[PDB]
Amino acid sequence: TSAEFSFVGESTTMRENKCFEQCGGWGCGCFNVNPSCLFVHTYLQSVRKEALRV
Amino acid sequence: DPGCSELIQASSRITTCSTEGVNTKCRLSGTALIRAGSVGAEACLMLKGVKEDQTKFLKIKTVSSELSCREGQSYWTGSFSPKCLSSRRCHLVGECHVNRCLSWRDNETSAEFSFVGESTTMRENKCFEQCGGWGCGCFNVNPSCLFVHTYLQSVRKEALRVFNCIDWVHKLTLEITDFDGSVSTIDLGASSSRFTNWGSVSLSLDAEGISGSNSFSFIESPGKGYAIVDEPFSEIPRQGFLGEIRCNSESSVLSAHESCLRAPNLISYKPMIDQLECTTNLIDPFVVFERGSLPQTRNDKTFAASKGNRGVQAFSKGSVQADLTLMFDNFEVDFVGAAVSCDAAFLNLTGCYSCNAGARVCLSITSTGTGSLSAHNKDGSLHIVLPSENGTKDQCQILHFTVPEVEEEFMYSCDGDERPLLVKGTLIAID
Amino acid sequence: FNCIDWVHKLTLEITDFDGSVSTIDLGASSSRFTNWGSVSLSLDAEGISGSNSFSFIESPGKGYAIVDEPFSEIPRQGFLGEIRCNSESSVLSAHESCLRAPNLISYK
Amino acid sequence: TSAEFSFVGESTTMRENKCFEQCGGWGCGCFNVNPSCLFVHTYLQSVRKEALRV
Amino acid sequence: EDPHLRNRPGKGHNYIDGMTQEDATCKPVTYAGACSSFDVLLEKGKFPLFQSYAHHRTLLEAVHDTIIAKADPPSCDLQSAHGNPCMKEKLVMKTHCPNDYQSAHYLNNDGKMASVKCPPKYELTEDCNFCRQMASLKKGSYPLQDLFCQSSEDDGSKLKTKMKGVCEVGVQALKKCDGQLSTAHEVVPFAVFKNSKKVYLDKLDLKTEENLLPDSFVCFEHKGELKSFDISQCPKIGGHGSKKCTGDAAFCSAYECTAQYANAYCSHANGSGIVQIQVSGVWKKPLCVGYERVVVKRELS
Amino acid sequence: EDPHLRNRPGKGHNYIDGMTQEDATCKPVTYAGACSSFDVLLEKGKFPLFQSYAHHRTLLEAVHDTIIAKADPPSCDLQSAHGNPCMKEKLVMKTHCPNDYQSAHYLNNDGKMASVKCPPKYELTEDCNFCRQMASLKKGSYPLQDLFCQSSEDDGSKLKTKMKGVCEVGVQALKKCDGQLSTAHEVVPFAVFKNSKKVYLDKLDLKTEENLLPDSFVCFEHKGELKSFDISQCPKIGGHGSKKCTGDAAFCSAYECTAQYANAYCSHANGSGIVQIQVSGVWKKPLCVGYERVVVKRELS
């Protein structure tokens, strides 16, 4: 669990943690010339109000 | 242009009304179905509360039929230029051994190049031996050694991202308008879902696709147009191939980061005792980018770029047959009965009949207050909604008919009382 | 040595604006730094394929040579290049950096 | 061995225990909103008094 | 790393009403400061949101920033009778309160600093709803909410709670539920703009847009530990302000360096910028956004 | 370790006007006496170039050897702000020292000696750019660059900056530009020819010939202070000369060694003698190649 989204909790909801590379410097929003990261905390939610047993 | 071509009524099982503050509101906790409109046409959603005048609509404007691409293995590339550094030292002096330079590792900084500095680029260290004696300025009889420290840096101010497409996803850019009037522009492809204020939406039926996309590599340019190459995706980067030096991000190419990949034993060298010229025969992607610049003519389709959202598309010339699933995440729909007047008049009626396009109607609505106007026919198959304000403005939308002599009576209102209205117009045969 | 690809090389004698004579050469897409800047090629043609089955021999101050056989890969007995070296000084002085064929020196 | 059916134990019969998932709330007779369970202790026994040896 | 965990830009005052036992060590907030209302905010495994957004503002710092007013009364008594403002908003809470604490401040619906306090020397219980008899007792309060603030000024008096399909959440009476109410304790965020109500949310989307702002620089005194020094006292180049300022090449490239005429040292920092919030699609500037664990009553059918 | 690198050839003086009162023990530089302007150049992990070429001269020693002149003023005054002679060349340079210094020397654009001065009792910053207030007070000049000193007679004052593609590097304005520049502190070498300016280097290709020249050896007075002894007076092998000399296998392999019957002790050095460099495709002999971390503004958009 990433520190940028650890406040959600370790529940039983289907979740996943990714990690992408962005840019660095003052061209996007940083201070060092090294590229920045992108913490992703994607969780799934139920859409249909009913389930089917195939 | 507005105008819901296909209109359907929501079911009463997922439509429960309520009353709070002399107002009758209702929410939707289900999902309806409606046919996807063509280029120009829309697909409204009639919502009924407890009586007749309380009627809401949800218009979804369709831009055009597009075929987006699905990106998979992507990588950045660009031009580079090495810089050879020579430093010859005598034999038996520090690390000037003829046997150490033979098996010298690339990731090992020698004692004669430990004063370079913060060089976090694609650097390497070789070791080529030379001659000795008093003829080349050497004190020892044994041959001398020449240390090599060449690092790669970026010289081009731009770069390119070479990627491929595993499947052509039929993406439809929809401009969904909420009940109150909130305009939201989204997109739906194949079976993808998004997130709107009224819940969620996803494309249902999809019977349009282009086969044979793995054997085509695409090139993305920052800001400029895209490109297309008639070859399969680049496998392993080897010598003499398009894409021998790749990375992962744009900054890894614009700054020549050591985290990228390159071909082994690619940087050539010219052992000239004391001189050294490190030159590489890198492949220039700008030549292919200029020879194959979008748009191009490929089979019976039109391959071009895309505005706003970055991504490749594919213009088609077929029909638009799809379905939409309007999922309502339990969102309340309120409505206030207006009491302003409005004397509308008919203008013209141009367009076509018996087709997915429709016919444009002209209405001169003259109202004295800011509100909304609702119109309907007699049998219950046509509904026209147009905004109204204080003044005289010309409105209208796209209407569908199956007769060139349209003589349908309309019933429009703006406060409660409904007055008759007759329309007319000659249409043409449009397939 | 051998040759994996024939590069169209053109020896150029670039003369500067002041009058200095500089003789260089270009190949495929290589660039050389000069006084006023750098020069490189842009388009090449006329290529000869199928050169991996031939080995060339270079002589110091004498000339070149051509051999009608594939290039020597691994040294062995009964083949050209039994005992090889890294440089000319490693051959004239017999250094341990060079390789040799296993069990090549016979004995009685 | 379930806790509700502890009066049987690990007997020398063809016993088994399952736990089915059911609904909760006040509509089914519960307090917590979490789904309840269903303790099933079904055992096999002979019917007639004549057997066969195939 | 993270050299900006305890340093608070701008104001940095964690003064609480009623629990007046840390006025000596609390204003300002330095690196070697002592305050129970800030030490628990950086505890490992408690408030990850404050650890991720450390270079911002808090609740009391926002109250002392002349942008958020205090409630009346600011410190309610837990041994009252009927008509307690800190009862309905406190009993519906869920976050467990640690031991050795007496006061507990939070945010009310109107957007003011609301706090409770028991009679000495009674500490809080497990839930923090009631009180009971008494390590050592802390000299301050405990933040009940994990929220943050910044330098914003947009109005939000026309925006209300956008929780669709929710009957009654927390203490606000939204809509009338037609089905059976489902009592469940969940985590629902909230958002308070400049002089507005507690606007709850469902999917918090916060983005950071950093730029050349004066809040991206700090200043610490020299030492022939660390101290505290306001960075807003450094004027531009070729000018003269109130206090002297100096730094390195990054700090001296934009501001005037007085060399030895100052008593601090400017360094190149970051973690500031302008943080936006996703409210009704339109990106606005939050002022009191965070998370609060309340009782959510949803529809069962 | 054995301090065998303290024996500097020639004069070996390291003192400047204004401050630095340690000239009584650093004139010349020998085993006895301590000096902060030279003991920091022998520690590993800092300046490896000077450690590799420790058989020549330094910067101050090159000034005292009629090679590098003295600028006016030779010591920059940090008491007056709002710009002073010695700010544009230092603010862009990124240096670091173990603090507790007052003076610092570097190279200017003209090619002379431009240093700073810290009046007592003021301490420099962690980078040496500005100053601050107040361990021990080291009045010596901290080496800001990593250059050396050598004697040469090859003329070449008709060459400027050889770097191509950089807008404004250091303090030299090669070309104008108001667009986006890749501002980053890079390590770019530099060299000074015979009476030339600050000639920046795009690449370093040194050349050292190991012969029998006196500059290629560090033969000093045999013991069993120490200055630079001429190795040409040593007798050849199988012959006779003037004075006597001795050494190890590297020195005794070509000359003659008499052990205790010698007046000097010769030994082989690592990286000493004629030092050439590549510039404009022509080999030239500079006077001292060093490194600096100045602001390099490369082109972009």
Residue numbers in the entry:
A (entry chain B), D (entry chain L): 796 to 849
B (entry chain D): 688 to 1118
C (entry chain F): 850 to 957
E (entry chain A), F (entry chain C): 154 to 287, 290 to 379, 393 to 469
What did the authors write?
Localized reconstruction of each of the four types of the Gn–Gc capsomers (pentamers and hexamers of type 1–3) resulted in four independent structures at resolutions between 7.7 and 8.6-Å. Imposing lower than six-fold symmetry (two-fold symmetry for the type 2 hexamer and three-fold symmetry for the type 3 hexamer), or no symmetry (type 1 hexamer) gave the highest resolution, suggesting significant deviations from six-fold symmetry in the hexamers. We first performed fitting with the localized reconstruction of the pentamer at 7.7 Å resolution, followed by fitting the resulting Gn–Gc heterodimer model to localized reconstructions of the hexamers at 8.0–8.6 Å resolution. Consistent with previous biochemical and structural studies, this fitting verified that the Gn and Gc assemble as heterodimers, which form higher order ring-like pentameric and hexameric capsomer structures on the mature virion. Domain A of the Gn forms a ring on top of these capsomers interacting with domain II of Gc, occluding a surface area of ~950 Å2. The Gn–Gc interface is formed between the β-ribbon domain of the Gn and the hydrophobic fusion loops of Gc11, which are shielded from solvent at the interface between Gn domains A and B. Surprisingly, unlike the rod-like array of extended anti-parallel Gc dimers predicted from the low-resolution modelling attempts, we observed that RVFV Gc forms a kinked conformation, not previously sampled in crystallographic investigations of class II fusion glycoproteins. Interestingly, the embedding of the fusion loops was only observed in the case of the pentamers and not with the hexamers.
Rift Valley fever virus (RVFV; genus phlebovirus, family Phenuiviridae) is an important example of an enveloped virus that harbours a class II fusion protein. As with other phleboviruses, RVFV displays two glycoproteins on the lipid bilayer envelope of the virion, Gn and Gc, which form higher order pentameric and hexameric ring-shaped assemblies. While the Gc glycoprotein is responsible for membrane fusion, the role of the Gn remains undefined. Virus entry is completed upon Gc-mediated fusion of the viral envelope and host cell membrane, in a pH-dependent mechanism.
